[PDB]
Amino acid sequence: NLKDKILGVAKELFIKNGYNATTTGEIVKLSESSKGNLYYHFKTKENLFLEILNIEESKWQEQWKKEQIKAKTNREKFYLYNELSLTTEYYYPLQNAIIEFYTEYYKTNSINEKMNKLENKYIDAYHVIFKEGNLNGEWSINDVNAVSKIAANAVNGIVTFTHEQNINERIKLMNKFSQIFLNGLS
Amino acid sequence: NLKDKILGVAKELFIKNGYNATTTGEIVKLSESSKGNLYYHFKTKENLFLEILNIEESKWQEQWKKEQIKAKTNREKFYLYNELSLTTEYYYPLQNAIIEFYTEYYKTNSINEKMNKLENKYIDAYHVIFKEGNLNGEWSINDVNAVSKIAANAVNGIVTFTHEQNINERIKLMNKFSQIFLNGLS
Numbered sequence: 001n002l003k004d005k006i007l008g009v010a011k012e013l014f015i016k017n018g019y020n021a022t023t024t025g026e027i028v029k030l031s032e033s034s035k036g037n038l039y040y041h042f043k044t045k046e047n048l049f050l051e052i053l054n055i056e057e058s059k060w061q062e063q064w065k066k067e068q069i070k071a072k073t074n075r076e077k078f079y080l081y082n083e084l085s086l087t088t089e090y091y092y093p094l095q096n097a098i099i100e101f102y103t104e105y106y107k108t109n110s111i112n113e114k115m116n117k118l119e120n121k122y123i124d125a126y127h128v129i130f131k132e133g134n135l136n137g138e139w140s141i142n143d144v145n146a147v148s149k150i151a152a153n154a155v156n157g158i159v160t161f162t163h164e165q166n167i168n169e170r171i172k173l174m175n176k177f178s179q180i181f182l183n184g185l186s
Numbered sequence: 187n188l189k190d191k192i193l194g195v196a197k198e199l200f201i202k203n204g205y206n207a208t209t210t211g212e213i214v215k216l217s218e219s220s221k222g223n224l225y226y227h228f229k230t231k232e233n234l235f236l237e238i239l240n241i242e243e244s245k246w247q248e249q250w251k252k253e254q255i256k257a258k259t260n261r262e263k264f265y266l267y268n269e270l271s272l273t274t275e276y277y278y279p280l281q282n283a284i285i286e287f288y289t290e291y292y293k294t295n296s297i298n299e300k301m302n303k304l305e306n307k308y309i310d311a312y313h314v315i316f317k318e319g320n321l322n323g324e325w326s327i328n329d330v331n332a333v334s335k336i337a338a339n340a341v342n343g344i345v346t347f348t349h350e351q352n353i354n355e356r357i358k359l360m361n362k363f364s365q366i367f368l369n370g371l372s
């Protein structure tokens with residue numbers, strides 16, 4: 001494809017380097033394409049980026065659907081979602097580029113809106129796990145939305161700020177995390 | 187002092203203009219020093235930045251030292267330290283250059299040595315809280331170092347990934363987290 005070759009190179013450059021780092025100049029030439037080749041699909045760089053986040057977000061929740069089966073209780077669903085976050089190849093390898101973007105562009109309308117529900121989809125996975133868990137009586141969270149946001153963020157922290165060490169040590173900490181968290185909810 | 191001036195001027199430059207944009211040439215002339223002297227003290231902008239970061243760390247510690255007296259029990263120190271990390275970083279100017287620097291050297295293993303002696307200093311704060319918490323029956327943790335890396339990175343994630351919404355709510359969530367986490371330790 002072409003529009004999909006752009007999305008491909010970009011994603012590659014957004015992960016390696018930052019958001020502000022890589023410029024629409026690179027993306028273009030690195031795809032043997034031309035500048036005037038960006039409009040109805042990718043006019044602005046923030047549009048291009050925000051699109052990739054949307055994709056990877058899909059791929060990741062899609063992958064979680066095909067893998068959340070290995071866990072019967074939601075307590076297990078919680079552990080498994082976190083451990084997996086560390087090994088995936090979707091969304092999470094972009095958290096660094098996302099943090100720049102969230103700051104550098106915090107004075108536009110395509111921040112508190114455009115990518116607004118992009119976060120709700122990210123805390124969504126936990127929204128279910130905690131709700132279904134209240135039905136399946138594994139715990140009792142009277143403020144799911146909070147805990148969800150809290151768990152989502154806490155986890156993303158462990159994933160993002162340890163990306164430089166024995167991947168199996170990360171898994172152990174992440175499981176040690178989930179144990180603590182869950183033992184705190186109940 | 188010529189060295190301390192270079193750091194201070196550089197700290198100001200990085201803040202006003204970000205990391206990537208600031209040149210060692212600028213630093214040299216504004217601190218009325220020289221390429222020679224700057225090279226001799228830091229060798230590179232990479233390092234210069236790390237030293238500033240180390241100094242910012244010490245200050246954070248001297249600050250935390252005076253502040254923790256407001257917290258008699260370690261359970262309290264945990265709440266306080268987390269809340270301070272969230273509120274203070276919200277209006278910390280060097281933060282932008284840190285983000286920029288971090289997402290520009292977390293792939294180059296060279297800048298991963300000092301880069302971690304540093305993070306370890308941040309984790310110590312939790313380590314002390316947790317250890318001391320043991321010697322007070324505030325809780326029993328036999329894997330302190332672990333629980334420490336966990337709390338540090340989780341808290342860091344809550345602070346960095348929530349960045350969107352009213353500050354009061356953020357503090358609300360950060361306290362919620364500290365409550366749950368400390369409860370899953372008992």
Ligand SMILES: NC(=[NH2+])c1cccc(/C=N/N/C(N)=[NH+]/N=C/c2cccc(C(N)=[NH2+])c2)c1
Pocket residue numbers: 236239240242243246249274275276277278284288301304305
């Ligand atoms: N109100 C305040 N007095 C206040 C508020 C927010 C932050 C600080 C001090 N921060 N000091 C920092 N953040 N030092 N960071 C240094 C550092 C060095 C190497 C690596 C990293 C890192 N984050 N990986 C950080 C002080």
